[PDB]
Every structure is written in C-alpha cells, then in structure tokens.
Amino acid sequence: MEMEKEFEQIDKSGSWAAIYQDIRHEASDFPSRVAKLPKNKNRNRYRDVSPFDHSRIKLHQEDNDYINASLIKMEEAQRSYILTQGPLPNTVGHFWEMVWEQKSRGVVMLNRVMEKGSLKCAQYWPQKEEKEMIFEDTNLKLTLISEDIKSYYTVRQLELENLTTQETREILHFHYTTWPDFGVPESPASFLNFLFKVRESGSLSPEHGPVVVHCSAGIGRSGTFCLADTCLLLMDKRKDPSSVDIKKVLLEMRKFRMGLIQTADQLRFSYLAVIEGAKFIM
Ligand SMILES: CC(=O)c1ccccc1Oc1ccccc1
C-alpha cells in the first residue's frame, strides 16, 4: 500500500502495536559474540543492546578492537551510517578514535546528557573554547571552535587532532536538544528541519566517511533519524515514489543493528516524518 493512506488505515483501526510486533517477529537474528566477551562488559551500556559481529566497527588497535557501534550500509540509497550508543566514562577515547579512523565529518546526537534525572551519556566534548580535552588512552586532542545555539538544536564546530601525527580535522556536532523525556514529538517539523541542516553540511555525503549517530542505546531515536533520511532519498531516486515501503526499509536496516525503532509510537512518528517531508521536498 501507499504510505499516507496505509497510515490513516492504521490510525483508524488502532493497530500500531500489532504492526510493530510483526516487525519484531520478522527481524534478523545474527550473532554478537564479541560484544558478550567478559573483557567487554564495561564497554556496553545495556546488556540487551549489542552490535552484530558481521557489521560491527573495529577499532584499529591490537589489544582490544571492540566498540558498541554498527555500520548500516544502504545499497540502493547509496548512504551509510554508523549507529552507536552514547559514550561511557571508559569509552570516550574509543568513540573519538572511531570518528578519526572512519573519516567521519559529522556526529549526530539525539539525547541530552541528563534525562529523567539520570545520566544518559558522558560529557564527551568540551564546553569552553579555552578548556580542551585530551584522551590519553587513544592519543587524541579535542577543542571547541564555535557553538551556535538555536531553539531546537545546537551546532558545534570541533577540532580533532591526532597527537601521534599532528594531523587535524574539522568535525561538526549536530545536537538535537528538544526530544521529550517521554514519548515522541507532537509534530515532525523541527526534527525534519534538523535532518535538512545535517544534510546541508556535507556530513551525509559520499566524499566523507559515514556520519556517526547516537542517542542513549543507539537504536531508538537513532533508528528514526536514519530510517527517515533513507526513505526520503529513495522517494527522490525512484520513478514511482509510492513504491517506497517504510516497513521493508526498516527490516533491511535491522540486518545491520538490532532493535531499530523501540516502540510503536516511534514507528508512527517515522511514518509521519516521511509523509510530511515528502511534501516539502517538492
Ligand atoms: C572555520 C573558521 O572560521 C575557523 C577559524 C579559525 C579557526 C578555526 C576555524 O574553524 C576550524 C578550523 C579548522 C577545523 C575546524 C574548524
């Protein structure tokens, strides 16, 4: 079925939970043996969220190459994404090592450091220009260059230096600051405006490594971001845009990381975002 009328048909029939459970039942199951090794317990935020072995990002390190991060490679759309958990106190150095080694231009953050009164990720970037951060375990230096605070999101320019080689690179940090503590946004308008700002920066384009996107676990809000982006790109590429099937795209992405889209409300919100976004593109 088309999307917008499939949407009204699920609303009127109140069957979002059944649709979402079907997706959960059909989703791929692949091994995640490296994530579950005892030496990696303090590298995982949640015991039930792990990268598959076949798609996990490897650190270029011979001691321990593990990080909780996955490469989502979308062949027809010609887009790739790295989805990862919010960094932990003992993985902030690994996080920036990955950004460096994968040649990423942008980092997309969809959570606040504190939500619901608890810490959802480490404070992993500097908050003042004159107070830079040094990660001694991976030999990197990180400096805040500029910060632009808007009503729904903040954009930061960062300088990452590899202290071994003295090479430097500019990284863009796109921070969506207004996702509610509970539920999903009422309108997708600010989320779509944010997606378009990430696109306009070059951070999603083939001349760079894959964008790094995270929330707390790296599957819920993060899944919503890449699902919406890929579906909108396919609608532009194909002769028949109504042939884009959001459920089929989501199952394809779930071949590369488990659990993408965590609730039926997030599934409905993803439909809404793609529907409204397809009208603005034209
Ligand atoms: C772009 C800009 O205005 C600027 C000026 C002085 C110093 C740094 C600047 O930004 C950079 C430069 C290099 C990498 C990342 C950001």
Q: Distance between CA atoms of 26 and 271, rounded to whole angstroms?
A: 19
Q: Are 195 and 274 in contact (CB under 8 A)?
A: no
- Residue 218 burial class via C-beta count within 10 angstroms: exposed 0-12, middle 13-18, buried 19 and up: buried
Amino acid at 81: Y
Q: Distance between CA atoms of 108 and 262, rounded to whole angstroms?
A: 18
Contacts of 148 by beta carbon, 8 Å cutoff, 6+ apart? 154, 155, 156
Superfamily of domain 1-282: Protein tyrosine phosphatase superfamily (3.90.190.10)
Q: Distance between CA atoms of 223 and 215, rounded to whole angstroms?
A: 9
Instruction: With CA atoms as reference, report the closest residue to 123 among 101, 104, 142.
Output: 142
170 CB near ligand 1 (under 6 Å): yes
Q: Give bridge partners of residue 149 from the DSSP assignment.
A: 154
Q: What is the resolution of this structure in A?
A: 1.7
Method: X-ray
Four-residue CA torsion sign, 245, 248, 252, 254: positive
Domains of the chain by residue range: 1-282
Catalytic residues: 215
**Residue 216: C-alpha distances to residues 87, 100, 123, 201 (Å):** 8, 21, 12, 24
Q: Distance between CA atoms of 124 and 142, rounded to whole angstroms?
A: 10
Q: In a 3-state reduction of DSSP, which class is residue 221?
A: helix
Nearest CA, atom 6, ligand 1: 145
Q: In a 3-state reduction of DSSP, which class is residue 72?
A: strand
Q: Distance between CA atoms of 86 and 82, rounded to whole angstroms?
A: 12
- For the chain, give me the number of helices (H) and strands (E)? 7, 11
Q: Are 163 and 141 in contact (CB under 8 A)?
A: yes
| CA of 127 relative to ligand 1 center, distance in Å | 16
Annotated ligand binding at 216? The verdict is yes
